[PDB]
Structure formats: structure tokens, C-alpha cells
Write a protein that binds this ligand. Structure first.
Ligand SMILES: CSC[C@H]1O[C@@H](n2cnc3c(N)ncnc32)[C@H](O)[C@@H]1O
Ligand SMILES: Cc1cc2ncccc2nc1N
Ligand SMILES: [Cl-]
Ligand SMILES: [Cl-]
Lengths: 622, 303
């Protein structure tokens, strides 16, 4: 169901308008709360002493109708950045008057225009209104993809329209929005109502609005084409933009008068909503968690809950890959002539509730080879589930071991060690330190599954996720601690500014006389767009055995691995990045005996502070 | 009566005289429960704004931003709904019947002006567009998106059907000529608000800005005066051989000016904004203003 509203600049009778708009089938109505031509003097007599009422009564609709069905519109004469001081001062008073009457009626949203470069005094008055009373209402900044000046008909003789491509110039309306929201200090109540023109701009201009808090999309009746039967429709390029906005779940506003001569327009958006690219298995399970920041799990430091193990286990494709890696490994180690004699010692290191234990047993059956299992598990709650499985089903074949793999003294050495100690950034659950301590009871020719894993980083733009991080300022800690820590998040409203590159790699077994798990990595990311850097997305790849692999990297993503969301490393100050410039990021993996942690810094195109120095805001517990 | 509303709306927007001297008053309710408008006729101008002593009256669906005569009987109207309405009088001129109401603009229609011929007219809207209309066929002949902001005022040439002016909040004053492939031409300061052609001279016009300044300009290639303290809402020349320029404003003051824009007459009679002015063709010395104070002030200009 598409959330849709009507935009009118003319309301003779407020009750009869809603009734017609309701029968047309819109959810809400954008309208003027004061009449749009009713200009108002505040300083100069005798116009300031005008007898009231100054607008309609609040009693004409119920309190419920104002809260849900009505959206306010700033009157078009209000120009707080006029060059004339009198129009500037009357606009200030009129804007506070209209915004305060919107707050009095309790409207859910209020539309303000961005239709010029200098909206500085407009921003100040809105910021004044935001810091006046504890009321919580949205402010939709109405701004177009292309300015009216840049889409005008080429009909002025002595002022022709430029036919040359201006790359930065064609994105000017984004700079109107960026300057306004920056002046208002990234208020969560200030969002975008993006207005679409009859001719769309280049893709880079549309891509400029990726990551931005778009709460509405205004579609004029004039942009709609006509088909053979006569109904209102849109071009293929316009339909492509609507499918992007439907994923952002924007409220589609319709503006202007009926040219196709009204539900014909709204019924077309419904037709596009049904006939879309279908909901895939990744997006289906990921519904709800879009750009929701969570703490990355720490299965070493913390004991994971029963439902957290249930979430890991609901993934039969990922364990059939583990089954395949063990199946191929057992054939390579044990030949056909040593089938009944050679029993292989498998050791599931971090066995949880025995999904790899079952995958190891199913692998031995299809391989037709004998095995001996060790379900090693630190979390003594999960050991209850293992020992109930071991008693009821597995029997003496599986030996459960309620122990830390780094502490455990093994009775015999392992032919294969299977494990699943990887997070969204590969090594962020400390698989390297865990297997390093478990390496002594692997045999000289022993295999690790996984044998190798690599983390990946990519720079991203999302002013939405920047605000989500900014809103995690907690009470009894550093006020910028939220920016110096990773978050597991289904990244949704964002812009990948460069292809991901590999950051840290680890191999198992680690056959080195001197083992160091600390790292330092310098990456350089070519950026071909104008944008703002807000953080770095993190993914990982892993080799289970030979060619059997797992990956959450978007371009080489494994099939049906739905629950596994990527990680986000934010930065404190968003960095401006021009088209052509290189984002140079630095990443350290650091440790002592007690804690492991990441530090990171941007060094180009401008220098950031080092984030999380000495793990002051974030540590991973050993 | 007959078939007309009892109470006239508070905010008087337009006031025009036809040849025989009947006064066309247009009005909007810009506040209160219902935001509608209305069209009125006063064969006795002194009776206005009293509703009971009027010749004709009718209710419109939305407010009236501007209107003008179409010869002697027709009334062209610029609506809030985004539509140009044409109303024609009946045989006895008792009723005011709607001829058509075409919804072509996407925003409020702010300004409207009939061309020299009388069969065609031009409108200007907050949707940025300017549309040339055919009043016989009731259709848009041409639709022009020249400006980059609200179209504030459009003024048809007195004697040339092709030529007309327009001004807008994009700070442009366009001289139009529909015979050219590119008809608009930018002439060339604070934003231009009002326009008026010189009635005798085809190549000369005047424009008022938002800062209360009226300026005299020739098409080829300048004199100006600080008349008002606030925006100049309208500029209307008199019917005299050497005409006088009436100038309206949001400072609630009228000012009649000479050829060189010097202050002859001043009137602070209106208590709200003065919206439109019109000279009587019967007596050229009189001047009728209307404003949002709901007054019809009949002035006596010393000439
Ligand atoms: C199947 S989820 C990963 C599992 O690895 C376990 N784990 C993590 N670190 C260690 C360790 N050092 N020794 C044993 N098990 C571990 C966790 O308790 C969890 O059940
Ligand atoms: C076993 C396991 C599964 C995970 N799934 C999602 C995110 C992190 C995970 N960490 C793990 N150790
Ligand atoms: Cl969190
Ligand atoms: Cl520490």
C-alpha cells in the first residue's frame, strides 16, 4: 500500500476538500493554514492593526484529523532572505506565526520551500522555532532535482540557456539542502520533500540524494505522459526513480491541477507498486532492520542467548557449505584403501548448539569415511543443549567439552579443526587469538575450516546513518563515544563511494615462529562523484576449504545468507569529497593481554582525528 | 438579487470602469471559514461597496487574485484554483453567467490582461508559466516557461496583439513579441512588482518594485523616484491627453504622479493595503481605489 497525499494551494471549504480528497483515495492533504495571498504587516501602521480573524478556526476539524490528515504549507509570500529589510522582518514574524499555528494544531509535517541559494535567515527562524517548546513535528524542505532556472524554456532571446555540461552546477539544489540542514545542525525533524521535474537530470545529480533523509517525493501532474487509451503514465526513466523511492518508503505527494481530463494519477502509482522487481530472500528477512544500529555480537566475552543461536542455525545453505568443506577435506586426507582403518579426529571449536556437529556427521556419511568428534564450547548454557543432543542422539561418537579452546588440554591432537568464530568484519569476534591458542593440539599436517578469512572496507555516504549514530549520545560517557565504535546494521539508505578493498587477512594454521595478530593497513579509494563521507562499510570473505567459500561482500555475496548484515565504522565530522579526489583511510588492529580493538583515521582528502585510540570507546574482550 | 449572495467578501482586490462608467468590483475572503470570491457590478459607483444597491452579483468557487473587462460585457478572472474564468452578462445585465472555467495553471493565477485585439488574452501564475488564451475557442494557444519564479504582473500592449510585458520574483522584466522564434526579451535592482504601458507612447512603460520605487523606462535603452515606503502593488495611467500615473502600495497610501514622476496628490485614506485603482471615463478628474479595508474611496485629483 503506497502512502500518498494531495497538494492544494486553494481550499475554499476545508471539510468539503478532505471529503473529495478522501473519495479520490489520498491518505493526507498538504494545504495552507493561512490563506496564501493573505499578506500580513507587523511593524508599520495602519496595516498591522488589521481586525481578525487572521485565519480559519481550529474547531473546523477534529484533533485526530489535524494529527493525521493535514500537512501545513508556509505561505509563498514569506521570504526571510529578501534583500529588503521590511520584507525580511515581516517574513520572520509571519514564519514564526505560521509554524507556531502548525504546532498549535499539532500537524505531523510542515512544508517549507528551498527555491534559492541563500536560505540562511530561513534556517535561523526554523532553528528558533525548533528550540521553542517540547512539541515534536516534522519539517519537509520542498526542493527540486533541477532548479526552475536550469529547466526553463529557451525562449529569452538575449539570455539563452547554457548547452554546456556544468557538473557541479547541475547538482546546485543538493547544495541548497546541504547548507540548510548544516545551518540547522542536522535536526532529525528536518527532512527532504524531493520535487521531480518533467525532464530528469543526469544520474550523478539523482545519485547525489542517496543517503539523504527523503520523507516525501512531490510529483506534479504536468510530468505525466499520456498512453493510447488516455490514462496518465510516466516514462521508463521516471519509473526507475519511483522504484528507488518506494524502497525508501517515501510519501508520494501529487501537486497541480488535472491535465488528463483525479484518482487516475494515484491509481498509476498503485500499478507501479504492485508491478515492481520482487522481494528477494535477503530483503525479506532484513525487513524491519533497515539502517537500525546494533552492537556487534561478542561470543567470546559474552554468553550468547538461546534465540541468538537459533538465528545463526536458521541458515541451511551456510552449513551445507561447511558440510562440503569437510566432505572434500576427509577425501583428500583419508584415501579409499584406508577407509575402515583411518578414523579422522574432528574438533568443532565453538560448537554452540551443534549445527557444525550435525554438518560434520552428515559430511562423514556422504564422504563414506569414519570420524571422531569433539564439541568444544565455552558458553556453559549452550553445553546443556549439546549434552542433551549428545545423550539422546549422537552418543559416544561426539565428546562434548565444556571449556575454552585456548585453556583446554586435549587428550589427542586434531586432524581437522572446524570453527565458526567469524563476525561481519571477519576477525571482530577474535577468531585469530582463539585458534592461535587452539593451534597447539592441531597435528603437524592438520587442516583448519575455515583455513583463511579477509575483511573488506568501502567508504559510504549516508546523512541518515550519520544522524542515527549522532543520536546514540549516552549519559555517563564521552559525548562523541558513539562515533568511535562499529555497528552491525542492514545498510539501506546509503551510497557506496568506491568498490570495497581488502583490509586485514588471517591464515589457519599460522605456522610462523613469531605470531603477531596486530595490523596496520593504508587503503586508497578512487571517488568519481561529489559527495560527503560519513563512514566505512565493512564486509568479509572466508575460505572454508579450497574453493568452498562464504562471503557477505555485495559483489561476491554467498547465496541465501540472509541474517548476516554488514558492519559500519562511522566518523565524527563528515568529510567533503569532490569528483576525482581519493579517500585515503587508515585502519589498525590493536591488542593487549585483556582487549582487542580497531582504530581508524581518514588522511585524504582532509585529515580526521584517530578514532578509538587505545580502545577508549570500544574494545572486543579476550 | 436576483441569484446573488447577501454579504460581499471583506478583501476588495480589483476595481475597473467600462466605457459607460459601470464599476466592476472583484473580492476575495482571505480569512474566516470559507475562502471563496465574488464578482459585482455598480452602475451607481457611489453606492459601492453597499451590496443592496448594486446592479449584478455572483458567487465564484475560489478567491479572485485579479480580473479585467473583455470589451463591455465579458469579465476575465484569475482564480486561486489554477484556472482562468470568463463570465458574460445576460441580455438585461441582471445576472453574471459563467461562459467557461478551464483549469490549466498548476498554482494560483495571480495576474491577467486582455490583448489589443480583444479575442485573446494572457495570464500569469505562481506555477512560473505565462499562457496566451483564445477567448472564442476557450483554449491555451501557447504555454511559456520563461521565468524561474512566481509571475507577479503581466500587462498587454495597448495597440499590438503580439507584444506584452511580464515581471517575476526572478528579478526579470521580459518584453514579449510572439512573432519572434524566441519571443521573450530581458530588459537590462529590487524585484519588479507592477507594470503599466504608456497609453500614447508605444515604446515606453513604467514598473514599480518591492522597495516602493516607480521607474520610467524606454524599450530602446532612465528616471525614477522613491514614491512609497513599501511594495508598489499597481500602476494605472489616467485617460487624459497628458496622462497622470496613479501608484498603489502595501503602505496603505495612494500617490498620483506627473510625466516626470513628481508627487502631485497624496491620500492616506485606506487603513489596509490599496489593491486596484481605476479612472472614471465620464469625469477624468475622479479616481476610485479599493483595498482590504473594504473601502471604495472616490478621490478628487486636482488637475
Ligand atoms: C556458534 S557461535 C560461536 C561460538 O564460539 C564460542 N566461542 C567463542 N570463543 C571461544 C573460545 N575461546 N573457546 C571456546 N568457544 C568459544 C561461543 O561461545 C559461541 O558458542
Ligand atoms: C557463528 C556466528 C554467526 C554470526 N552471524 C551473524 C553475525 C555474527 C556471527 N558470528 C558468529 N560467530
Ligand atoms: Cl546500539
Ligand atoms: Cl584497553
Amino acid at each position: 500500500r503506497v502512502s500518498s497525499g494531495r497538494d492544494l494551494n486553494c481550499v475554499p471549504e476545508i471539510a468539503d476538500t478532505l471529503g473529495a480528497v478522501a473519495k479520490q483515495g489520498f491518505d493526507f492533504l498538504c494545504m495552507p493554514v493561512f490563506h496564501p495571498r493573505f499578506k500580513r504587516e507587523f511593524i508599520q501602521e495602519p496595516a498591522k492593526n488589521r481586525p481578525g480573524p487572521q485565519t480559519r478556526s481550529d474547531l473546523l476539524l477534529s484533533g485526530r484529523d489535524w494529527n493525521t490528515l493535514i500537512v501545513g504549507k508556509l505561505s509563498p509570500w514569506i521570504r526571510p532572505d529578501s534583500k529588503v529589510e521590511k520584507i525580511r522582518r515581516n517574513s520572520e514574524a509571519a514564519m514564526l506565526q505560521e509554524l507556531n499555528f502548525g504546532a498549535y494544531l499539532g500537524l505531523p509535517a510542515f512544508l517549507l520551500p528551498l527555491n534559492q541559494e541563500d536560505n540562511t535567515n530561513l534556517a535561523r527562524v526554523l532553528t528558533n522555532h525548533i528550540h521553542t517548546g517540547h512539541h515534536s513535528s516534522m519539517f519537509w524542505m520542498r526542493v527540486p532535482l533541477v532548479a526552475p532556472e536550469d529547466l526553463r524554456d529557451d525562449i529569452i532571446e538575449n539570455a539563452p540557456t547554457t548547452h554546456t555540461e556544468e557538473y557541479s552546477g547541475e547538482e546546485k539544489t543538493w547544495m541548497w539542502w546541504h547548507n540548510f540542514r548544516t545551518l540547522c545542525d542536522y535536526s532529525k525533524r528536518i527532512a527532504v520533500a524531493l520535487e521531480i521535474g518533467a525532464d530528469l537530470p543526469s544520474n550523478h545529480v539523482i545519485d547525489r540524494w542517496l543517503g539523504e533523509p527523503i520523507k516525501a517525493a512531490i510529483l506534479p501532474t504536468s510530468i505525466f505522459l499520456t498512453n493510447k487509451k488516455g490514462f496518465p503514465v510516466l516514462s521508463k526513466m521516471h519509473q526507475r526513480l519511483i522504484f528507488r523511492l518506494l524502497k525508501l518508503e517515501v510519501q508520494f505527494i501529487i501537486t497541480g491541477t488535472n491535465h488528463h481530463s483525479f484518482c487516475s494519477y494515484l491509481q498509476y502509482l498503485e500499478y507501479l507498486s504492485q508491478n515492481r522487481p520482487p522481494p528477494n530472500a535477503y530483503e525479506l528477512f532484513a525487513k524491519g532492520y533497515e539502517d537500525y544500529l546494533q552492537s556487534p555480537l561478542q561470543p567470546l566475552m559474552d554468553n550468547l542467548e538461546s534465540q541468538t543461536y537459533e538465528v545463526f542455525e536458521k541458515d541451511p545453505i551456510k552449513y551445507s557449505q561447511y558440510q562440503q568443506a569437510i566432505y572434500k577435506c576427509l577425501l583428500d586426507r583419508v584415501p579409499e584403501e584406508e577407509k575402515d582403518t583411518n578414523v579422522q579426529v574432528l574438533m568443532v571449536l565453538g560448537a554452540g548448539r551443534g549445527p557444525l556437529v550435525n554438518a560434520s556427521l552428515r559430511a562423514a556419511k556422504q564422504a563414506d569415511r569414519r570420524i571422531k568428534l569433539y564439541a568444544v564450547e565455552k558458553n556453559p548454557n549452550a553445553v546443556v543443549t549439546l549434552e542433551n543432543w549428545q545423550f539422546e542422539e549422537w552418543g559416544s561418537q561426539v565428546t562434548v567439552v565444556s571449556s575454552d579452546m585456548r585453556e583446554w588440554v586435549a587428550p589427542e591432537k586434531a586432524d581437522i579443526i572446524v570453527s565458526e568464530l567469524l563476525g561481519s568484519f571477519a576477525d571482530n569476534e577474535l577468531s585469530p587469538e582463539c585458534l592461535d591458542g587452539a593451534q597447539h593440539f592441531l597435528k603437524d599436517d592438520g587442516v583448519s575450516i575455515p583455513g583463511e578469512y579477509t575483511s573488506f572496507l568501502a567508504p559510504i555516504s549516508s546523512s541518515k546513518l550519520y544522524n542515527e549514530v549522532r543520536a546514540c549520545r549516552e549519559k555517563d560517557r564521552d559525548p562523541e563515544a558513539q562515533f568511535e565504535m562499529p555497528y552491525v546494521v542492514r545498510l539501506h539508505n546509503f551510497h557506496q563511494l568506491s568498490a570495497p578493498q581488502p583490509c586485514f587477512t588471517f591464515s589457519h594454521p599460522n605456522r610462523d615462529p613469531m605470531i603477531d595478530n596486530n595490523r596496520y593497513c593504508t587503503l586508497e579509494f578512487p571517488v568519481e562523484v561529489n559527495t560527503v563521507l560519513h563512514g566505512f562499510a565493512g564486509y568479509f570473505e572466508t575460505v572454508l576449504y579450497q574453493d568452498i567459500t562464504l562471503s557477505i561482500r555485495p559483489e561476491t555475496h554467498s547465496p541465501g545468507m540472509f541474517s548476516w548484515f554488514p558492519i559500519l565504522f562511522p566518523i565524527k565530522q563528515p568529510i567533503t569529497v569532490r569528483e576525482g579526489q581519493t579517500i585515503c583511510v587508515r585502519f589498525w588492529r590493536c591488542s593487549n593481554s585483556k582487549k582487542v580493538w580497531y582504530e581508524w583515521a581518514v588522511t585524504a582528502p582532509v585529515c580526521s582525528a584517530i578514532h578509538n585510540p587505545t580502545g577508549r570507546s570500544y574494545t572486543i574482550g579476550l | 438579487p436576483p441569484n446573488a449572495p447577501a454579504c460581499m467578501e471583506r478583501q476588495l482586490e480589483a476595481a475597473r470602469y467600462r466605457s459607460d462608467g459601470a464599476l466592476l468590483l472583484g473580492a476575495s475572503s482571505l480569512s474566516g471559514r470559507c475562502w471563496a470570491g465574488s464578482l459585482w457590478l455598480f452602475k451607481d459607483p457611489c453606492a459601492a461597496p453597499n451590496e443592496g444597491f448594486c446592479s449584478a452579483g455572483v458567487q465564484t468557487e475560489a478567491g479572485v487574485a485579479d480580473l479585467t473587462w473583455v470589451g463591455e460585457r465579458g469579465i476575465l478572472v484569475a482564480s486561486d484554483s489554477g484556472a482562468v474564468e470568463l463570465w458574460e452578462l445576460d441580455e438585461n445585465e441582471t445576472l453574471i453567467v459563467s461562459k467557461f472555467c478551464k483549469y490549466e495553471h498548476d498554482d494560483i493565477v495571480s495576474t491577467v490582461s486582455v490583448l489589443s485585439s480583444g479575442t485573446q488574452a494572457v495570464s500569469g501564475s505562481k506555477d512560473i508559466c505565462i499562457k496566451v488564451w483564445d477567448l472564442a475557442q476557450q483554449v491555451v494557444l501557447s504555454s511559456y516557461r520563461a521565468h524561474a519564479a512566481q509571475v507577479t504582473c503581466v500587462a498587454a500592449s495597448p495597440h499590438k496583439d503580439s507584444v506584452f510585458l511580464s515581471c517575476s520574483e526572478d528579478n526579470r522584466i521580459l518584453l514579449w513579441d510572439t512573432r519572434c522564434p524566441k519571443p521573450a526579451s530581458q530588459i537590462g535592482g529590487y524585484l519588479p512588482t507592477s507594470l503599466a504601458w504608456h497609453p500614447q507612447q508605444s515604446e515606453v512603460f513604467v514598473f514599480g518594485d518591492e522597495n516602493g520605487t516607480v521607474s520610467l523606462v524606454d524599450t530602446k535603452s532612465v528616471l525614477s523616484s522613491a514614491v512609497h515606503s513599501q511594495c508598489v502593488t499597481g500602476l494605472v495611467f489616467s485617460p487624459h491627453s497628458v496622462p497622470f500615473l496613479a501608484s498603489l502600495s502595501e503602505d496603505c497610501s495612494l500617490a498620483v504622479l506627473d510625466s516626470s514622476l513628481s508627487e502631485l496628490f497624496r491620500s492616506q485614506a485606506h487603513r489596509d493595503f490599496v489593491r486596484d485603482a481605476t479612472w472614471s471615463p465620464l469625469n477624468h478628474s475622479l479616481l476610485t481605489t479599493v483595498g482590504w479595508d473594504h473601502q471604495v474611496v472616490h478621490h478628487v485629483v486636482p488637475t
